[PDB]
Coordinates of C-alpha atoms and ligand atoms in Angstrom, one line a residue:
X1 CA -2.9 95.2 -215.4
X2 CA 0.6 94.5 -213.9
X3 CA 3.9 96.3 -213.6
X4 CA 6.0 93.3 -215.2
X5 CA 3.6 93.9 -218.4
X6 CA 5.2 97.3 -218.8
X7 CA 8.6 96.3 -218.1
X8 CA 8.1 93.7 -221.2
X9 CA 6.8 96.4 -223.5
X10 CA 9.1 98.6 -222.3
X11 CA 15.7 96.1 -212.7
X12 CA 14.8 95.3 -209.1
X13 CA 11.9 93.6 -210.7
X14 CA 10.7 89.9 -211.5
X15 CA 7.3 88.3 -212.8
X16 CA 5.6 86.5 -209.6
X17 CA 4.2 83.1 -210.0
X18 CA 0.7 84.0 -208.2
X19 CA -2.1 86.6 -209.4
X20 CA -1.8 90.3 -208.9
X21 CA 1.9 90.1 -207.2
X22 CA 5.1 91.5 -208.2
X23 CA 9.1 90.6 -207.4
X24 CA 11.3 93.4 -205.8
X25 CA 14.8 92.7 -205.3
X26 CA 14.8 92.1 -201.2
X27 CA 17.4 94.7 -199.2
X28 CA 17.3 94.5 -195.1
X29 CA 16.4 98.2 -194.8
X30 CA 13.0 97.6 -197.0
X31 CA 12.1 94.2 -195.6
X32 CA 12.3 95.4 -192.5
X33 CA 10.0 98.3 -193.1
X34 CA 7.6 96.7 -195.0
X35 CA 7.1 93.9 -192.2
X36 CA 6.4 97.2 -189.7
X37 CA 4.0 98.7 -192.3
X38 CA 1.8 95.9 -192.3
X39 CA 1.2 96.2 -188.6
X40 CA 1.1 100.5 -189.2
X41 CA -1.6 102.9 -189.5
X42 CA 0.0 103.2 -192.7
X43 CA -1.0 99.3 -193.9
X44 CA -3.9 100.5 -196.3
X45 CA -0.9 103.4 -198.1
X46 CA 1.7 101.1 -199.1
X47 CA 1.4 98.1 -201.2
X48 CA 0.6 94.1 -199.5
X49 CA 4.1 92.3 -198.2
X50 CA 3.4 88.8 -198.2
X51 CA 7.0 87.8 -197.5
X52 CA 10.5 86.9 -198.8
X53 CA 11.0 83.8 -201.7
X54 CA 14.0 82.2 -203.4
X55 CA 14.2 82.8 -207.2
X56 CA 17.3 81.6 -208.8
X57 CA 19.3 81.6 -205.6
X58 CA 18.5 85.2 -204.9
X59 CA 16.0 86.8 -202.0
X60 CA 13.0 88.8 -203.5
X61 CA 10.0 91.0 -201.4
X62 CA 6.8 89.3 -202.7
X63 CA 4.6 92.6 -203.1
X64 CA 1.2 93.3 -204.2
X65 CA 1.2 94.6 -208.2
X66 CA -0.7 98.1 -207.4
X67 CA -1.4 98.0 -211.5
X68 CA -3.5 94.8 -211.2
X69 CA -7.0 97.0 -210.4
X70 CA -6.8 99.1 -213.2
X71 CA -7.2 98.8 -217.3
X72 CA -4.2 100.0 -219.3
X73 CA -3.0 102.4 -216.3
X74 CA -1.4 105.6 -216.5
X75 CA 1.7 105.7 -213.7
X76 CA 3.4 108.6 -212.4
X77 CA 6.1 108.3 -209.5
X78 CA 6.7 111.6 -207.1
X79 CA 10.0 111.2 -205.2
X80 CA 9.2 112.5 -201.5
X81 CA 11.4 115.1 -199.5
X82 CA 13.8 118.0 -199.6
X83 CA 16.7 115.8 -198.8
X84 CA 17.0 112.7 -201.1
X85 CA 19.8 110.8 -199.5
X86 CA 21.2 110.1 -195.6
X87 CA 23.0 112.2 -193.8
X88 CA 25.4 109.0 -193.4
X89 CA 26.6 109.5 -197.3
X90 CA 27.4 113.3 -196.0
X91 CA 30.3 111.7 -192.9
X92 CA 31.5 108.7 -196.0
X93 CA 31.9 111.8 -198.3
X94 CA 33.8 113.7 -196.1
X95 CA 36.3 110.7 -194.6
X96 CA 36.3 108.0 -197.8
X97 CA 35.2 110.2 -200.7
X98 CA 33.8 107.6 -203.7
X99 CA 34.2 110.1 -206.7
X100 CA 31.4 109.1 -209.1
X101 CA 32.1 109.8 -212.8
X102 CA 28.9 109.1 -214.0
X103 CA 26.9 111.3 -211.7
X104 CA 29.9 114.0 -212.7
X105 CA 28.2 113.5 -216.7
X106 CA 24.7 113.6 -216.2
X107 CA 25.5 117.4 -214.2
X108 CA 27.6 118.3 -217.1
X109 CA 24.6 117.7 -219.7
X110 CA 22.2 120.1 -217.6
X111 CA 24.7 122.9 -216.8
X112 CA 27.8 122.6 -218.1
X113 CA 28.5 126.0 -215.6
X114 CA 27.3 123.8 -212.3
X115 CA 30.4 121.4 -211.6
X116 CA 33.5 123.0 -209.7
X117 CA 36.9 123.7 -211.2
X118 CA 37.8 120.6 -209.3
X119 CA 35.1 118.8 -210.1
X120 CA 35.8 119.5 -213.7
X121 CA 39.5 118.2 -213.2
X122 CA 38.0 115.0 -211.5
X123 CA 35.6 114.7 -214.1
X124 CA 33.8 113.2 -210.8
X125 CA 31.8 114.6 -208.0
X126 CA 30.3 112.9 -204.4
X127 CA 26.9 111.3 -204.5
X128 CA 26.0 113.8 -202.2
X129 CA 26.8 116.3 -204.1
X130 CA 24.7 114.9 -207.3
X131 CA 21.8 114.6 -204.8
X132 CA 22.0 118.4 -203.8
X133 CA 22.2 119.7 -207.1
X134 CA 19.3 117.4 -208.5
X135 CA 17.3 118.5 -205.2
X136 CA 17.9 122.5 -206.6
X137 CA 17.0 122.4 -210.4
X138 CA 13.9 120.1 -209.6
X139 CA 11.6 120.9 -207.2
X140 CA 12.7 119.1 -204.5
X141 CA 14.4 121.6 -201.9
X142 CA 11.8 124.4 -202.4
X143 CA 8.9 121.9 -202.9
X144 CA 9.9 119.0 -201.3
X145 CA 9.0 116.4 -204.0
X146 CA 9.5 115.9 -207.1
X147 CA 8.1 114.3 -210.4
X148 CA 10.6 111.3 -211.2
X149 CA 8.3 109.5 -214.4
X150 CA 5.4 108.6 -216.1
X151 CA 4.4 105.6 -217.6
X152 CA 1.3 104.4 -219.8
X153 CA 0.4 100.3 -220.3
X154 CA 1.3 101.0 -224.1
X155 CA 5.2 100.9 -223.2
X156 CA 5.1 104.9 -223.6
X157 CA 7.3 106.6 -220.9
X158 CA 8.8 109.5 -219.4
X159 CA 11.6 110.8 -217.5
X160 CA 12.5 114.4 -218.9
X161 CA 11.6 116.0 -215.2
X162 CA 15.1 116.9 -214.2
X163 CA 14.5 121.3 -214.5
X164 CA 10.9 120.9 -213.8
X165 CA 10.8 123.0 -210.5
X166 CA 8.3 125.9 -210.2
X167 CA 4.6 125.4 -208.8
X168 CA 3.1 126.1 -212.3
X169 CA 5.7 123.7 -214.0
X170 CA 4.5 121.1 -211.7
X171 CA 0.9 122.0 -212.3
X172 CA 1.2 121.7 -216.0
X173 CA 2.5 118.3 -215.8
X174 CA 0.1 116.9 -213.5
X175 CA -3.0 118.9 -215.9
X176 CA -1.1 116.6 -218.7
X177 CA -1.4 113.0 -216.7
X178 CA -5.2 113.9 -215.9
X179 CA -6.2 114.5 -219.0
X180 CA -9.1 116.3 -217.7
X181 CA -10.5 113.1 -215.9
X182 CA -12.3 115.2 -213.1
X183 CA -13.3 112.0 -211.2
X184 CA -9.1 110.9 -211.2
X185 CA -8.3 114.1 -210.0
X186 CA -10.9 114.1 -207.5
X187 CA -10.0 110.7 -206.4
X188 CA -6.4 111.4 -206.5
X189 CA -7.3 114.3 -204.0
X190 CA -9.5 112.3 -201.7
X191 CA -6.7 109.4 -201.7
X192 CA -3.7 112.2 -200.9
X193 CA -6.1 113.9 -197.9
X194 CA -6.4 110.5 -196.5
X195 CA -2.8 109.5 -196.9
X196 CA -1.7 113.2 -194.9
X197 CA -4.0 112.0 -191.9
X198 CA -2.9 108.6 -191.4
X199 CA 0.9 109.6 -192.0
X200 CA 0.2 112.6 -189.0
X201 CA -1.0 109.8 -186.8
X202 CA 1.4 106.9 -188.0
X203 CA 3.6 104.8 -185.5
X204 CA 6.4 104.2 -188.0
X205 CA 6.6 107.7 -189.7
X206 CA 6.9 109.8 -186.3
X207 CA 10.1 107.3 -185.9
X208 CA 11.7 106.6 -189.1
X209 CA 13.8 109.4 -191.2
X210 CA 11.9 108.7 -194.6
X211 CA 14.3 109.2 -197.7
X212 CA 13.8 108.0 -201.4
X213 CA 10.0 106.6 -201.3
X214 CA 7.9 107.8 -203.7
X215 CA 4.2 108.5 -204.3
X216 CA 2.9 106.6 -206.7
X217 CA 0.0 107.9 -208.7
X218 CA -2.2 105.1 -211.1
X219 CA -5.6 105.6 -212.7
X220 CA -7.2 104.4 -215.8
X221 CA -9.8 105.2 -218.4
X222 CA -12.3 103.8 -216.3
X223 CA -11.4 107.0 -213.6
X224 CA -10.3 104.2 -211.3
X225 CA -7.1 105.9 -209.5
X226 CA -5.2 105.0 -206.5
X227 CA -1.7 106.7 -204.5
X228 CA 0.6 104.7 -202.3
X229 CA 4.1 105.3 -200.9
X230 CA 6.5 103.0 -202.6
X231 CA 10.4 102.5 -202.1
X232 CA 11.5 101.9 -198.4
X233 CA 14.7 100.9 -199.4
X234 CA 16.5 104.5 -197.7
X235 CA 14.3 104.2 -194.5
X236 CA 15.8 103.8 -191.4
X237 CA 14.7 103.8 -187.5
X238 CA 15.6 107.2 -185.7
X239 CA 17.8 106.3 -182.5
X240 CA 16.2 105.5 -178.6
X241 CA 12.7 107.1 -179.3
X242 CA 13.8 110.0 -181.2
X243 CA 10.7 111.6 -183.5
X244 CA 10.7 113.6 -186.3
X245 CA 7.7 116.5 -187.3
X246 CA 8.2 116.2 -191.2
X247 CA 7.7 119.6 -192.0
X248 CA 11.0 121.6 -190.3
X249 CA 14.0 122.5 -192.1
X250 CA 17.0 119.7 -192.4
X251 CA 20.1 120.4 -190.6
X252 CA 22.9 118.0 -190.8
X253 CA 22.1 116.3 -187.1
X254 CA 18.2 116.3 -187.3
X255 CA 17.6 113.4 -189.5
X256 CA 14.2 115.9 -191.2
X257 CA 13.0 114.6 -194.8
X258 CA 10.3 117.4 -195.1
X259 CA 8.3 114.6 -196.1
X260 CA 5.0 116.7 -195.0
X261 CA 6.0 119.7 -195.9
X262 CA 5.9 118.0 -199.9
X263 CA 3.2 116.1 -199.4
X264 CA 1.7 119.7 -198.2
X265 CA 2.6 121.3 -201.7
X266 CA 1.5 118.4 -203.4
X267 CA -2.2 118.6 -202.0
X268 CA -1.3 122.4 -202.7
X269 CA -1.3 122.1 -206.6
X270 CA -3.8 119.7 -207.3
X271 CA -6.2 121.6 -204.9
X272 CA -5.4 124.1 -207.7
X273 CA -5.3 121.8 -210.9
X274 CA -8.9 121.0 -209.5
X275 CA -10.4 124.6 -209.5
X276 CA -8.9 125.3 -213.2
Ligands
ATP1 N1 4.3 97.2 -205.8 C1 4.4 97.8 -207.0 N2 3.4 97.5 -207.9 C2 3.5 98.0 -209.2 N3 4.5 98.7 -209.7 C3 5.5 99.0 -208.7 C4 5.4 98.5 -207.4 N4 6.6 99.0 -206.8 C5 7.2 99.7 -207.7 N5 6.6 99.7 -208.9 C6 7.1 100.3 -210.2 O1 8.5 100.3 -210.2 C7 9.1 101.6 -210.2 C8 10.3 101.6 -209.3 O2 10.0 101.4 -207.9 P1 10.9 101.6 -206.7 O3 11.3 103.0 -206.6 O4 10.4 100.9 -205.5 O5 12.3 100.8 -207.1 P2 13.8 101.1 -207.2 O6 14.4 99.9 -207.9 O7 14.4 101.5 -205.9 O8 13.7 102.4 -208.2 P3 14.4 103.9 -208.0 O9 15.9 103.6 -208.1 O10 13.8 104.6 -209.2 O11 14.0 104.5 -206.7 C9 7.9 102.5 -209.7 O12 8.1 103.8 -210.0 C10 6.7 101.8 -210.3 O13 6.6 102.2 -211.7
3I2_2 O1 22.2 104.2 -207.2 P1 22.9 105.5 -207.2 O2 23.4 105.9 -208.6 O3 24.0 105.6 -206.2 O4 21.9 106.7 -206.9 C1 20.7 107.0 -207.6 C2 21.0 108.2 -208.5 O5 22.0 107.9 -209.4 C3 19.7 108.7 -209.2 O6 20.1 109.9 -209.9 P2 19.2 110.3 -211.2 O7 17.7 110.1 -210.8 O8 19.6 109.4 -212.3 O9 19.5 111.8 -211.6 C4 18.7 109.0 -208.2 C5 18.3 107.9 -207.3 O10 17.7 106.8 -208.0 C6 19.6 107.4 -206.6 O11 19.3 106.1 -205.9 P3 19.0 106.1 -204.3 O12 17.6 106.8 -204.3 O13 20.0 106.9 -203.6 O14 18.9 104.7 -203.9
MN3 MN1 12.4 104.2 -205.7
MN4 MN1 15.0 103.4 -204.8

């Protein structure tokens, strides 16, 4: 039905007035790449931009609700790429450190052994260095996504993903948000294929350094079930016609996300889920 539903059962987001839409709190980076994306190969993957509006003196994407199609849908958000923040929080770190004690708890609480001595005398650590430990005990650095959530039109959530990292550990959960639908899966797989070729061929993506979208994986009862990248709000233009492949490693200087090289694994494991 609609995202906003969930919420209430249950941010950045805001009830639209119209049918089938949905509020996101507007930043320049996202606006930006949204407007592009509607002009992209990748128009179909992403959800509708219709534009900016004014809600209480405040700026807010009007985007298509991608829960509207669906009855009662199951949600489950896949944070894309080995890295997970820009290389610009790396140079910020280095010259104007922003110690963050709340990322310095929620390390504590998973391994109480993983903070430095320093750290521990902070009782602080970087953002980056948060990102890179979160990227290590998930899947994200071997992988190159992740599973953030998953969320059912009952209110019923989940976000206890932070140590799932191994292929089969990723399997499993995926098995669990199918629930044996055969037709979602196969949809889902169809969907994915399709979403690989049009990112290979896309403008925007051979020229922007893609960091902190999702994938976003709905379906229903009915087996309806649809993906699309979600989240530009970390994607930025590469400098005078640079490109990027997606797949190589990332070395401070090269901007890479391993984007593909996820999206690769992803295909990967349900192309296995599937023959189970
Ligand atoms: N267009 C959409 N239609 C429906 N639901 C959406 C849409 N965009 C986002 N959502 C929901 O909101 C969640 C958060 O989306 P998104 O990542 O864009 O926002 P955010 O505020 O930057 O969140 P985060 O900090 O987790 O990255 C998604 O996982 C999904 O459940
Ligand atoms: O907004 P801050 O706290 O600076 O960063 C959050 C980070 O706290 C969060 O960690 P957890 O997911 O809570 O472990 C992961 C991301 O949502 C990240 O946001 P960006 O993607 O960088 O915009
Ligand atoms: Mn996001
Ligand atoms: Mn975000």
């Amino acid at each position: 039905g609609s995202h906003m539903s969930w919420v209430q059962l249950a941010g950045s987001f805001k009830a639209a007035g119209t049918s089938g839409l949905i509020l996101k709190r507007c930043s320049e980076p996202e606006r930006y790449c949204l407007a592009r994306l509607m002009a992209d190969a990748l128009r179909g993957c992403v959800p509708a931009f219709h534009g900016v509006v004014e809600r209480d003196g405040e700026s807010y994407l009007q985007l298509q609700d991608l829960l509207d199609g669906f009855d009662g849908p199951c949600v489950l958000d896949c944070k894309m790429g080995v890295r997970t923040y820009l290389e610009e929080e790396l140079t910020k770190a280095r010259e104007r450190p922003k110690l963050r004690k709340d990322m310095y708890k929620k390390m504590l609480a998973v391994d109480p052994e993983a903070p430095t001595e320093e750290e521990h005398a902070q009782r602080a650590v970087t953002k980056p260095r948060y990102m890179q430990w979160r990227e290590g005990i998930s899947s994200s650095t071997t992988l190159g996504f992740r599973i953030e959530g998953i969320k059912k039109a009952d209110g019923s959530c989940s976000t206890d993903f932070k140590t799932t990292r191994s292929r089969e550990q990723v399997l499993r959960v995926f098995e669990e948000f199918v629930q044996g639908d055969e037709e979602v899966l196969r949809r889902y797989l169809n969907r994915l294929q399709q979403i690989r070729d049009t990112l290979e061929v896309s403008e925007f993506f051979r020229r922007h350094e893609v960091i902190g979208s999702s994938l976003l994986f709905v379906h229903d009862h009915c087996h309806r079930a649809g993906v699309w990248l979600i989240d530009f709000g970390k994607t930025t233009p590469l400098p005078d016609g640079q490109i990027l492949d997606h797949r190589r490693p990332w070395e401070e200087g090269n901007r890479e996300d391993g984007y593909l090289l996820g999206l690769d694994n992803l295909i990967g494991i349900l192309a296995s889920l599937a023959e189970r």
